[PDB]
């Protein structure tokens, strides 16, 4: 499968031996020309308007447009200290796009942060990276050094006068650090408890200064827009989401991997053609479209385009667009138990519903695994689903945690009632006291 | 009886130079101490506190908040196997059973000779090549329970 | 049969109320249910109580 | 500013949040993490009320009344069924890991968690699994520590650090293993550390001097005196 630059704006310059493309090869393969055009012939407001016209949405699953987020900066010159943050955490399970895209293409991310910092007048950028990406950290630091010695970073960048510095902040392995307010809190060396919005980070973010936090894939889509134009960027595919996306299936498939595809591509073409369908003797039962924090879907929803709006009314989220396939042999009770165990061991411990309701669901699913379920457990899980929705908890970790549970209850309720065996016992007999035998 | 070395202190100061608030270098200071020592002892919290200038309560909260910052002593190698959902579909439990019948320990304890420390960990970002397991500097993928005895014996 | 001669002798102190055995309830023990640690009962040894996990433990 | 609570009109200060505005009128809203002297953080998720967008609405939205300003013409409901069920569920979640310690606890009869449990009307237990436990520290001669009774409302750390300026108390731990205390043993060196026995809504921090010769609040004879 070939990858021309016209339909693969991110992965066309990859190498077959999975080696990192360094500064000379990247510059040979149309490197920093968009950054040069932006920093020479374009005002920062012109770049912001071009990004807004390009319709660049948030690649982190939120779907928020990048132009509107960049337009939320105050116009005051007194608040001149502005910050750019790259969310290279990627702590969500079933998400491996950032590792591939920054292990062999770090200069693309460097150029994207350079353009996004010049468009926001931010003098400092921080790549908040997870601690498990050792090779990616080494490649990113080497790329930063190569850009610094070539004059692409630091003071008086390419003779323009804009001064920008780049740093890589390696995280210490916490899933809630991917939340942008919690990313700011973890960046400041604090416990990564999230912050309450309003105020948004665009007004008071990193150390009170205005801050823009962007995903890795958005900052990699930026140089393609700034180098190959905007009207070309909107003419990649006839869909409601301009640009491409790193998409692919994983989990007991013939060819698990990552491919750059335009929006509107249905999941069956990703499964049956790119992933080669299921393995031998494995019948497809369910799939998750956007990682561990999204609603499960069945084979009926497999013939559906993978867009934000297409999956939004389908009853799930597009997310990171890295789908997971589940066959029959995996018990859904054990799968949801592992999901809730991950979400209950990676909570930040700030607010009551997530902190003191995810262990209850974990214990209920553990009892359902061993056949120790009691009448009133599925109702408790449904109550947890009802009372951990958007706005009930302090941050958005818990709605995304309870979405797979509600989807497995909606679509696979027969496997949950197979774990309820013993009657509801909560009290033991006390001799001398006749119990209140309620009805 | 904890004394910070000169190399650790100058590395902490160099990390402090990259932030306008010295509190922001607490995570990297803890990781530097953990890399130089294997684990973060009790006096290292106070040492990082009076090097940075922040109270030791914040340093202790940061150290105990993150899972990859160790506060209890470990072995010379830390086995960190992914127990998340894609490796569950790929069957990490056979790999865990192989590790348990080899090391004869439980997840969270260390061997009697202090060689390996068995630990479950979060998603390693290698879900397409699942299951995966992390030793101190290497990430191994496409795991089988039969290859675990060959994999563990090369780490002394 | 608690009739007395002097009204002051109807004030039963702690030694006049404490009996040798459990009385009408023969098996209930409150401190097996309570969460406070006492002699012979450490934290986590009470009914429906897990063992205490330290914050410095290596588990995530 | 003008608010409408349960179809009743009230006049409140426009710069106050909804929780303190409704508490000043005598209306009852359960709350843990909010204190008048410390501000609002939105932690405990106990102060939920159903806010309507305009005068004629039926859906509403569950909002944190400690985090919601009491602006002009604000239509809210306290005694809605969804809000009351959510508050009872929050109390029930706080009661899953709570020790069976009320008779042997120095905060019994003075406990904010007891009053908020009774006020939300939660008296039936269905959580049947194990309850987490914590070791107790030694905080000095004045403050007695019992971390089992904590509900993780962050009042202690907020007061002791933002208000009292103390440096040796903080929050440690993780998802449900949060520990509020010193990093080791020793006396709290703050000169205003004694207010923790009233800031803490539970029996975590207790007056050890009172706990030596202990009696309950209804058995006390008080007088308004000067120190
Ligand atoms: C629990 C949680 C975890 C998140 N983890 C990540 C992450 O690992 N990477 C990421 O880019 N965004 C993550 N996000 C989304 C961020 O809050 C935010 O949307 C993102 O950093 C920037 O949005 P953007 O896509 O417009 O750039 C997470 C959100 C939540 C609630
Ligand atoms: S839902 Fe609450 S406790 Fe859970 S991660 Fe978010 S803020 Fe933290
Ligand atoms: S110790 Fe008390 S004040 Fe502190 S968080 Fe727990 S319940 Fe709140
Ligand atoms: S803090 Fe309150 S609820 Fe907890 S044991 Fe004491 S009196 Fe009971
Ligand atoms: S789920 Fe194991 S590497 Fe991602
Ligand atoms: S009082 Fe509002 S959430 Fe705690």
């Amino acid at each position: 499968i070939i990858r021309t630059p016209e339909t693969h704006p991110l992965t066309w310059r990859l190498r077959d031996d999975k080696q990192p493309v360094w500064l000379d090869e990247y510059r040979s393969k149309n490197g920093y020309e968009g950054a040069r055009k932006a920093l020479t012939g374009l005002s920062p407001d012109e770049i912001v308007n071009q990004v807004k016209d390009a319709g660049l949405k948030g690649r982190g699953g939120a779907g928020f447009s990048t132009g509107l987020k960049w337009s939320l900066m105050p116009k005051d010159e007194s608040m001149n200290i502005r910050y750019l943050l790259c969310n290279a955490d990627e702590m969500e399970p079933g998400t491996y796009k950032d590792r591939l895209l920054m292990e062999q293409l770090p200069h693309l991310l460097v150029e994207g942060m350079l353009i996004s910092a010049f468009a926001l007048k931010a003098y400092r950028g921080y790549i908040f990276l997870r601690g498990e990406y050792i090779e990616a950290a080494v490649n990113l630091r080497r790329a930063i050094a190569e850009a610094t010695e070539a004059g692409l970073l630091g003071k008086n960048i390419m003779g323009t006068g804009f001064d920008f510095e780049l740093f890589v902040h390696t995280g210490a392995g916490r899933y809630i650090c991917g939340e942008e307010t919690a990313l700011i809190n973890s960046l400041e060396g604090r416990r990564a408890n999230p912050r309450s919005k309003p105020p948004f980070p665009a007004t008071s973010g990193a150390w009170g200064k205005p801050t823009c936090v962007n995903n890795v894939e958005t900052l990699c889509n930026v140089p393609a827009i700034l180098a190959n134009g905007v009207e070309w960027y909107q003419n990649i595919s006839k869909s409601k989401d301009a640009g491409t996306k790193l998409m692919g299936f994983s989990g007991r498939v013939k060819n698990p991997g990552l491919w750059e595809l335009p929006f509107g591509t249905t999941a069956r073409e990703i499964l049956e053609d790119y992933a080669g369908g299921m393995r031998d003797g494995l019948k497809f039962k369910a799939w998750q479209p956007g990682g561990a924090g999204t609603d499960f879907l069945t084979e009926a929803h497999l013939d559906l385009p993978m867009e934000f709006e297409s999956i939004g009314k389908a009853g799930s989220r597009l997310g990171t667009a890295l789908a997971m396939a589940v066959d029959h042999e995996i018990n859904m009770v054990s799968l949801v138990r592992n999901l809730e165990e991950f979400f209950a061991r990676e909570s930040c411990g700030w607010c009551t519903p997530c902190r003191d309701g995810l262990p209850w669901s974990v214990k209920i699913l553990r009892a359902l695994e061993r056949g120790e379920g009691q009448p009133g457990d599925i109702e408790t899980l449904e109550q947890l689903c009802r009372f951990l929705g958007p706005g009930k908890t302090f941050c958005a970790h818990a709605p995304g945690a309870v979405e797979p549970l509600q989807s497995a209850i909606k679509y696979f309720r027969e496997e949950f009632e197979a774990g309820i065996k013993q009657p509801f016992s909560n009290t033991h007999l006390i001799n001398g006291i006749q119990p209140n035998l309620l009805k | 009886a904890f004394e910070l070395s000169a190399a650790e202190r100058e590395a902490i100061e160099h990390e402090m130079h990259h932030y306008e608030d010295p509190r922001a270098a607490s995570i990297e200071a803890l990781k530097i101490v953990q890399k130089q020592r294997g684990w973060v002892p009790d006096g290292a919290i106070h040492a990082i506190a009076d090097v940075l200038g922040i109270p030791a309560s914040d340093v202790e909260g940061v150290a105990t908040f993150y899972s990859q910052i160790f506060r209890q002593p470990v072995g010379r190698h830390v086995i960190r196997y992914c127990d998340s959902v894609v490796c569950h579909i790929n069957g990490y439990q056979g790999i865990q059973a192989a590790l348990e019948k080899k090391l004869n320990i439980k997840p969270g304890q260390t061997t009697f000779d202090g060689r390996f420390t068995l630990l479950p960990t979060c998603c390693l970002g290698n879900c397409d090549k699942g299951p995966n397991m992390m030793i101190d500097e290497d990430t191994h993928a496409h795991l089988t329970p039969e290859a675990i005895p060959e994999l563990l014996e090369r780490y002394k | 049969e608690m009739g007395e001669y002097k009204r002051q002798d109807l004030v039963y102190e702690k030694e006049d109320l404490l009996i040798s055995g459990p009385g009408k309830y023969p098996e209930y023990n409150f401190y097996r249910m309570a969460g406070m640690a006492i002699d012979g009962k450490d934290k986590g040894e009470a009914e429906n109580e897990a063992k205490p996990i330290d914050v410095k433990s290596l588990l995530p | 500013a003008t608010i409408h609570v349960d179809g009743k009109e009230y006049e409140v200060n426009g710069a106050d949040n909804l929780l303190e505005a409704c508490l000043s009128l005598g209306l009852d809203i359960p709350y843990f993490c909010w204190h008048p002297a410390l501000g609002s953080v939105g932690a405990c998720r106990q102060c939920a009320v159903k806010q309507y967008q305009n005068a004629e609405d039926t859906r509403g939205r569950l909002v944190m009344s400690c985090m919601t300003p009491a602006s002009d013409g604000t239509f809210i409901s306290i005694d809605d069924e969804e809000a009351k069920q959510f508050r009872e569920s929050v109390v029930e979640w706080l009661m899953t890991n709570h020790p069976h310690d009320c008779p042997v606890c120095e905060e019994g009869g003075n406990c904010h968690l007891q009053d908020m449990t009774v006020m939300t009307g939660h008296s039936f237990r269905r959580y049947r699994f194990t309850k987490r436990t914590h070791r107790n520290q030694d905080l000095g001669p004045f403050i007695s520590h019992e971390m089992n009774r904590c509900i993780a409302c962050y009042r202690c750390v907020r007061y002791y650090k933002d208000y009292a300026g103390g440096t040796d108390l903080g929050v440690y731990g993780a998802h449900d293993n949060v520990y509020f205390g010193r990093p080791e043993d020793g006396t709290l060196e703050s000169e205003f550390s004694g207010n923790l026995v009233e800031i803490c809504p539970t029996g975590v921090f207790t007056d050890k001097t009172h706990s030596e010769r202990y009696n309950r609040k209804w058995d006390m004879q008080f007088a308004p005196s000067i120190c």
Side-chain angles (χ1 to χ4, degrees):
Chain A
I1 305 302
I2 62 177
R3 284 178 298 199
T4 192
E6 281 80 18
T7 194
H8 286 98
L10 261 53
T11 60
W12 72 270
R13 54 172 73 87
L14 287 186
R15 291 180 60 178
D16 299 332
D17 45 352
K18 285 94 185 58
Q19 288 314 302
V21 175
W22 294 119
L23 185 54
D24 296 329
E25 189 179 355
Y26 186 75
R27 268 187 173 174
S28 310
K29 293 173 168 297
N30 194 25
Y32 295 94
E33 290 297 320
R36 181 192 58 84
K37 178 193 301 179
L39 268 85
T40 50
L42 283 182
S43 169
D45 282 29
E46 295 173 344
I47 305 164
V48 166
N49 287 323
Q50 264 202 330
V51 162
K52 188 179 184 176
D53 195 21
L56 183 53
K57 300 181 175 64
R59 294 305 189 269
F64 205 83
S65 48
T66 323
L68 180 59
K69 179 181 288 189
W70 288 358
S71 300
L72 273 175
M73 291 305 188
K75 297 298 171 51
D76 305 336
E77 289 332 283
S78 58
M79 301 168 43
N80 195 30
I81 296 304
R82 313 197 171 188
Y83 284 104
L84 176 58
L85 300 184
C86 157
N87 202 332
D89 205 13
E90 212 195 17
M91 271 295 327
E92 175 88 5
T95 317
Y96 44 87
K97 40 173 187 58
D98 302 341
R99 168 192 286 275
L100 166 139
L101 156 71
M102 81 192 46
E103 259 180 355
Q104 303 104 10
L105 278 187
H107 283 100
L108 177 58
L109 179 54
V110 171
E111 175 184 3
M113 280 185 117
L114 182 53
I115 297 173
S116 298
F118 183 71
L120 292 167
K121 296 173 302 305
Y123 84 114
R124 260 178 181 164
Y126 296 97
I127 301 176
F128 190 89
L129 176 60
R130 76 177 304 178
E132 284 81 20
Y133 292 166
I134 297 181
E135 295 183 348
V138 169
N139 298 341
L140 270 172
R141 284 190 170 88
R142 190 162 169 187
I144 283 178
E146 285 182 358
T148 315
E149 61 91 21
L152 296 177
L153 289 180
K155 319 293 301 180
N156 194 26
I157 296 180
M158 41 185 88
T160 296
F162 175 60
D163 303 332
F164 166 69
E165 205 161 1
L166 198 50
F167 295 111
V168 169
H169 175 85
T170 52
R174 181 61 54 170
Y175 168 68
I176 203 49
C177 287
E179 216 266 359
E180 45 155 9
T181 68
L183 196 132
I184 290 161
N185 268 338
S186 59
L187 177 71
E188 298 173 10
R190 313 175 162 273
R191 296 170 46 94
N193 310 117
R195 299 170 175 183
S196 45
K197 295 169 294 189
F200 286 88
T203 310
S204 49
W207 303 280
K209 313 300 176 304
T211 315
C212 263
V213 188
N214 290 128
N215 200 4
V216 158
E217 191 169 8
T218 306
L219 298 161
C220 286
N221 287 329
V222 163
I225 298 173
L226 261 292
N228 291 325
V230 176
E231 49 93 14
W232 171 91
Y233 178 74
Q234 303 144 280
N235 295 325
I236 298 178
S237 61
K238 293 331 147 289
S239 61
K240 295 186 60 59
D241 303 327
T244 56
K245 189 79 181 64
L246 302 159
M247 305 161 97
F249 264 73
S250 44
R252 283 194 182 179
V253 290
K254 292 190 174 305
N255 187 28
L258 180 57
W259 307 274
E260 175 163 22
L261 300 184
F263 280 85
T265 304
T266 73
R268 193 181 298 274
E269 317 153 297
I270 315 177
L271 180 57
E272 289 193 355
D273 309 323
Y274 293 99
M278 271 295 208
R279 290 198 304 187
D280 303 68
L282 296 185
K283 194 262 305 174
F284 176 82
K285 190 171 75 177
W287 69 295
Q288 254 190 336
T294 48
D295 301 279
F296 284 96
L297 286 174
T298 59
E299 204 177 1
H301 297 83
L302 209 61
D303 303 315
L304 196 67
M306 291 265 268
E307 301 173 359
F308 290 96
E309 289 87 15
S310 73
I311 309 291
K313 271 70 65 181
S316 174
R317 297 201 280 103
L318 177 57
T320 72
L322 293 189
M324 179 159 57
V326 191
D327 43 325
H328 31 109
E329 285 184 355
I330 320 294
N331 184 25
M332 287 293 290
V333 189
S334 305
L335 203 75
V336 177
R337 201 259 313 171
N338 208 6
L339 283 178
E340 296 298 318
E341 270 186 355
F342 167 77
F343 286 133
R345 83 173 180 194
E346 295 291 325
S347 149
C348 78
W350 182 255
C351 75
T352 290
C354 159
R355 158 187 89 244
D356 279 2
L358 296 189
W360 196 355
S361 57
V362 158
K363 285 161 165 61
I364 279 186
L365 290 163
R366 279 176 185 159
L368 283 193
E369 274 187 0
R370 301 193 296 270
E372 303 180 1
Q374 296 189 2
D377 292 336
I378 314 180
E379 282 81 11
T380 309
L381 301 175
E382 288 169 354
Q383 176 169 330
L384 172 88
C385 160
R386 182 171 32 252
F387 282 155
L388 261 74
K392 273 86 175 177
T393 78
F394 186 77
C395 94
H397 156 86
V402 303
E403 274 174 353
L405 181 49
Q406 100 192 307
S407 70
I409 282 180
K410 192 217 303 283
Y411 289 116
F412 293 94
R413 205 186 172 90
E414 56 267 7
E415 300 193 13
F416 293 137
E417 310 233 348
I420 300 180
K421 303 305 186 184
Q422 48 202 248
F424 186 62
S425 168
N426 195 12
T427 85
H428 63 86
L429 280 178
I430 294 169
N431 203 6
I433 298 180
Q434 277 150 293
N436 200 51
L437 303 176
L438 57 93
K439 288 287 176 295
Chain B
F2 183 84
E3 317 93 341
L4 266 188
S5 74
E8 289 152 338
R9 187 176 282 98
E10 68 94 9
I12 288 172
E13 291 162 14
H14 205 324
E15 291 290 329
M16 270 163 53
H17 297 159
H18 308 317
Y19 301 98
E20 55 178 1
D21 196 11
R23 187 197 288 260
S26 58
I27 302 181
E28 207 70 29
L30 285 162
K31 289 191 73 169
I32 279 159
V33 173
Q34 184 193 341
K35 184 152 311 303
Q36 288 343 282
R37 251 61 172 260
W39 67 294
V40 187
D42 313 286
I45 294 298
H46 203 5
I48 292 181
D50 41 47
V51 162
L52 256 56
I54 60 179
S57 53
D58 320 291
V59 196
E60 181 76 27
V62 167
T64 59
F65 182 76
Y66 298 108
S67 54
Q68 321 297 356
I69 305 179
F70 303 135
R71 280 295 272 118
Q72 281 182 5
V74 300
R76 309 185 307 285
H77 301 275
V78 173
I79 289 171
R80 264 211 300 111
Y81 65 97
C82 180
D83 66 348
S84 286
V85 75
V86 197
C87 304
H88 172 88
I89 294 189
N90 296 131
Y92 82 99
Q93 306 121 306
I95 317 298
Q96 180 190 5
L99 287 157
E100 282 172 2
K101 75 222 182 193
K102 260 201 104 189
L103 309 180
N104 321 337
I105 59 184
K106 285 321 320 173
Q109 323 164 10
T110 316
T111 67
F112 101 95
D113 42 314
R115 182 175 177 190
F116 291 112
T117 310
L118 187 64
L119 280 172
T121 180
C122 36
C123 165
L124 296 183
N126 214 12
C127 327
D128 49 346
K129 310 177 173 56
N132 323 296
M133 62 160 299
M134 181 95 58
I135 308 159
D136 313 318
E137 50 167 8
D138 324 314
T139 300
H140 303 284
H142 305 280
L143 298 165
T144 49
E146 296 89 10
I148 298 305
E150 194 265 351
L151 188 48
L152 297 193
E153 66 188 7
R154 91 172 79 151
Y155 291 89
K156 297 306 176 182
Chain C
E1 300 180 354
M2 321 175 56
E4 294 272 357
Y5 296 103
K6 312 290 281 213
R7 193 184 138 191
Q8 189 66 46
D9 276 275
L10 275 166
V11 183
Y12 275 47
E13 305 278 342
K14 188 186 160 184
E15 72 268 353
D16 303 301
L17 306 155
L18 202 51
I19 63 176
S20 302
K24 302 191 294 199
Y25 309 95
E27 49 90 23
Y28 182 74
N29 193 16
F30 170 73
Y31 267 115
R32 291 179 67 251
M33 316 281 176
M36 196 186 26
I38 60 168
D39 158 51
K41 176 231 165 176
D42 176 64
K43 297 292 194 186
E45 296 184 0
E47 290 202 10
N48 278 314
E49 287 214 321
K51 307 276 325 170
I53 305 167
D54 201 1
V55 296
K56 305 183 221 273
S57 55
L58 303 164
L59 311 173
Chain D
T2 305
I3 63 175
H4 298 81
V5 191
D6 289 331
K8 268 202 172 215
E9 185 180 353
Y10 298 94
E11 183 84 21
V12 292
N13 177 36
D16 282 353
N17 63 75
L18 214 57
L19 175 56
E20 55 184 349
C22 294
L23 280 180
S24 307
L25 305 155
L27 306 153
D28 283 343
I29 294 174
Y31 67 101
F32 294 110
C33 73
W34 177 79
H35 193 262
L38 313 179
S40 302
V41 283
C44 62
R45 314 297 285 186
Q46 184 62 78
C47 69
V49 291
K50 185 175 288 292
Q51 187 180 20
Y52 311 104
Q53 284 298 85
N54 49 40
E56 181 56 33
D57 201 353
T58 320
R59 284 291 320 310
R61 189 166 50 95
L62 274 181
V63 293
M64 270 329 100
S65 49
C66 79
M67 301 294 297
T68 286
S71 61
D72 186 78
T74 314
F75 296 84
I76 61 161
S77 182
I78 298 173
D79 307 328
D80 203 314
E81 270 291 336
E82 175 167 12
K84 285 176 66 60
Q85 277 321 120
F86 183 78
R87 292 194 289 255
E88 188 184 347
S89 291
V90 168
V91 175
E92 177 172 7
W93 287 325
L94 286 189
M95 288 311 277
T96 51
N97 301 313
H98 201 67
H100 194 94
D101 266 2
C102 290
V104 294
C105 180
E106 290 93 345
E107 275 284 319
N110 212 27
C111 175
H112 185 60
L113 178 58
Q114 271 187 347
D115 315 349
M116 290 322 109
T117 296
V118 160
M119 171 175 327
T120 54
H122 178 59
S123 55
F124 189 77
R125 190 173 175 86
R126 39 182 199 154
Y127 182 83
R128 78 185 185 275
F129 313 104
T130 49
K131 314 188 291 189
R132 61 112 196 85
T133 43
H134 281 114
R135 303 283 175 180
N136 297 329
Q137 276 172 343
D138 185 78
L139 302 182
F142 308 138
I143 314 284
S144 173
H145 195 211
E146 192 92 20
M147 181 45 58
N148 269 11
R149 296 154 183 165
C150 175
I151 64 181
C153 81
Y154 294 86
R155 269 181 136 163
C156 51
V157 281
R158 279 164 57 218
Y159 159 72
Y160 196 89
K161 212 174 300 176
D162 303 339
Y163 208 97
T167 65
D168 38 27
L169 196 135
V171 54
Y172 327 108
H175 32 86
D176 60 320
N177 226 51
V178 279
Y179 202 97
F180 300 88
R182 314 189 79 256
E184 42 186 11
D185 284 345
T187 317
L188 290 165
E189 76 208 31
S190 172
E191 277 69 28
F192 325 98
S193 83
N195 301 309
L196 281 179
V197 305
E198 303 183 5
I199 288 303
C200 182
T202 53
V204 188
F205 307 106
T206 40
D207 197 353
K208 189 181 287 190
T209 80
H210 177 216
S211 179
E212 181 64 39
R213 303 284 294 173
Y214 179 75
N215 53 309
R216 303 277 191 197
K217 197 209 172 167
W218 58 82
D219 273 357
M220 294 277 210
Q221 177 165 28
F222 291 103
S225 185
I226 313 297
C227 175

